Amino acid sequence: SMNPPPPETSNPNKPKRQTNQLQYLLRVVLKTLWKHQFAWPFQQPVDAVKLNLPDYYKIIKTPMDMGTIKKRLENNYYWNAQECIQDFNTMFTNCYIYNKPGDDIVLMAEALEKLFLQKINELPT
Numbered sequence: 628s629m630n631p632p633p634p635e636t637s638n639p640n641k642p643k644r645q646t647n648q649l650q651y652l653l654r655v656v657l658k659t660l661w662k663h664q665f666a667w668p669f670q671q672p673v674d675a676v677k678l679n680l681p682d683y684y685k686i687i688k689t690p691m692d693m694g695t696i697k698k699r700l701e702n703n704y705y706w707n708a709q710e711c712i713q714d715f716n717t718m719f720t721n722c723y724i725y726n727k728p729g730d731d732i733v734l735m736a737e738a739l740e741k742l743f744l745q746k747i748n749e750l751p752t
């Protein structure tokens with residue numbers, strides 16, 4: 628099909644360890660973006676088949692979405708906060724490199740990214 632397998636969300640050989648920053652990323656950053664009214668197109672991998680975007684996965688080499696990020700956090704997949712922040716950045720980058728500037732989806736991503744950056748600027752050190 629046009630769709631790859633979804634990204635892995637668990638890391639079985641990784642030991643489970645909580646950190647203040649990972650708690651913040653799940654319970655402040657992800658939670659705030661997830662509840663936002665513009666979150667829904669980002670809550671699951673892009674279905675290029677059903678959306679009829681045949682070139683999506685030609686352009687996007689590293690698929691990423693907030694559902695994957697949520698499950699990675701809930702499964703303690705990330706070793707540190709920077710890995711999680713990278714996934715958020717990749718999700719936004721994908722939207723901005725595939726869609727045309729000013730598209731509704733781009734406006735929705737920009738609103739979410741502003742909120743993300745606002746919350747990331749209060750991440751505990």
Ligand SMILES: Cn1cc(-c2ccc(C(=O)Nc3ccccc3N)nc2)c2cc[nH]c2c1=O
Nearest residue numbers: 667668669673674677678680721722725726732
């Ligand atoms: C990250 N991302 C996401 C999307 C995206 C994802 C899901 C839906 C959706 O389910 N809409 C929908 C609305 C109402 C009824 C049924 C359906 N199916 N729409 C858009 C997209 C489209 C072009 N580009 C993107 C894009 O970059």
